[PDB]
Design a protein around this ligand. Structure first.
Ligand SMILES: O=c1ccn([C@@H]2O[C@H](COP(=O)(O)OP(=O)(O)O)[C@@H](O)[C@H]2O)c(=O)[nH]1
Length: 443
């Protein structure tokens, strides 16, 4: 019997793929331990088949992380802090577990979020192999390793509509938005890349037919073996939700005609002005399409939830809720399109359920996902110039109703089929997973 320890980053878009992976590996016969912070912990009672061990922010909490905000853009400060100071505790916890191991039980490897770059030297020091889970795309990684070239050209220092030097796929505007903050994130980025290259293997939440153009860069830049597995095609992330689901939406979805509903959601951490929030609502109403709009409490700066919205303003066609089982909604027959912030989990979920998209973005990898999805794969329309009700209504109707958008709807259907075929024997994802299991078993 072989045990795998997995160590996620404690945010929704990082906990979801690592617990999907944990379940996949469990299905292949591995026992599973999850190392996790108390902060943003998932519901351990949803995982009776996993062992959870809480680390790094136990009582008494550190002056470095104590009273750090549990929500907002500053909650992420925990990441660099744990990278800089958690090595000794992580080693102690790994040793404790390796000591408590049953005689017939071996710890095969540690799998961490790529953001936990500090974990490589910890694993090395224990003669424990470390594999890395990337929670972003191969295309985004290709952009990462092109930063030096981008910097030479001055893209990173603030011709926007112009094609980038080595990315005809990208506009200079995309790169500026993606690396808008860079003196701040440059240091994290370099260390993550360096310790990913130094790892024993890299697992990508993707599939070959999704990012074929990006495979050679990964093979050339990362000496460790890479494995591409589209985790949403194996299972949804419902069990790792950090918020309660509103499942009353499914009775409502059951009252809608096929492909008639726009699903709208901007992920787990995004926030918008009161002004932009109201413009989005007017664009949705103006589209005349039915819509289901997830507005996470905290999404609107200065309001607990959705106070600025007039009572009944959404009217007949629209519903607003706080949180749903997103991939399950995307799989419902009523959904015709997905207005996304282009987070990678949401984008891959939509691809895997065959739902075409309208893209907004909040920086980081999101503009790159939106550009790649909209111009390379051609499964959506990118609202790349802010929020204006007219352009919003036109984009929604183009994807969902216009005859001119049929090719986008068809591309989304075909791309889902490619994902499905990739999981069949002889498919790319099937062979990646087979290779991953045999590789881990050889450690
Ligand atoms: O109402 C919601 C909204 C989002 N999600 C999930 O939250 C994750 C968001 O991750 P993503 O990479 O899309 O964006 P992030 O939150 O990291 O910005 C995805 O797995 C979604 O399915 C969900 O379960 N219910």
């Amino acid at each position: 019997r072989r045990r795998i320890i997995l160590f996620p980053v404690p945010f929704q878009g990082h906990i979801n793929p690592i617990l999907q992976l944990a379940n996949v590996l469990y299905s292949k016969g591995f026992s599973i331990t999850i190392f996790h912070t108390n902060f943003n912990k998932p519901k351990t009672s949803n995982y009776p088949h996993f062992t959870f061990r809480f680390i790094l922010d136990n009582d008494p909490q550190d002056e470095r992380i104590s009273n750090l905000p549990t929500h907002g853009p500053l909650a992420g400060m925990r990441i660099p802090i744990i990278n800089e100071h958690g090595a000794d505790e992580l080693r102690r916890e790994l040793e404790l577990l390796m000591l408590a191991s049953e005689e017939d039980e071996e710890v095969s490897c540690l799998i961490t979020d790529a953001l936990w770059y500090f974990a490589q030297s910890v694993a090395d020091s224990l003669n424990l192999r470390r594999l890395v889970l990337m929670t972003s795309s191969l295309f985004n990684f290709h952009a990462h390793v092109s930063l030096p070239q981008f910097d030479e050209l001055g893209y990173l220092d603030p011709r926007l509509e112009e094609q980038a030097s080595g990315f005809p796929m990208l506009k200079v505007k995309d790169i500026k938005s993606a690396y808008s903050n860079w003196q701040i994130l440059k240091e994290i980025l370099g260390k993550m890349i360096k310790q990913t290259k130094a790892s024993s293997g890299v697992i990508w939440n993707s599939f070959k037919e999704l990012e074929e153009s990006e495979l050679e860069t990964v093979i050339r830049e990362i000496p460790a073996p890479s494995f591409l597995i589209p985790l949403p095609k194996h299972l949804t992330a419902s069990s790792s939700s950090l918020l309660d689901h509103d499942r009353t939406v499914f009775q409502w979805l059951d009252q809608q005609p096929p492909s008639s509903v726009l699903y709208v959601s901007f992920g787990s951490t995004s926030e918008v002005d009161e002004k932009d929030f109201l413009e989005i609502a007017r664009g949705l109403v103006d589209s005349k399409q039915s819509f289901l709009w997830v507005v996470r409490p905290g999404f609107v700066k200065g309001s607990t939830w959705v106070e600025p919205l007039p009572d009944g303003f959404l009217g007949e066609r629209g519903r607003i809720v706080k949180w749903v089982p997103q991939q399950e909604v995307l799989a419902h027959g009523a959904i015709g399109a997905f207005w996304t912030h282009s987070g990678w989990n949401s984008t891959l979920e939509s691809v895997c359920e065959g739902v075409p998209m309208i893209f907004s973005d909040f920086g980081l990898d999101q503009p790159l996902n939106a550009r790649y999805m909209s111009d390379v794969l051609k499964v959506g329309v990118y609202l790349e110039n802010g929020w204006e009700r007219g352009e919003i209504a036109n984009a929604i109707r183009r994807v969902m109703v216009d005859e001119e958008g049929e090719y986008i709807r068809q591309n989304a259907r075909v791309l889902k089929q490619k994902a499905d075929v990739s999981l069949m024997k002889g498919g790319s994802s099937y062979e990646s997973l087979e290779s991953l299991v045999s590789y881990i078993s050889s450690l």
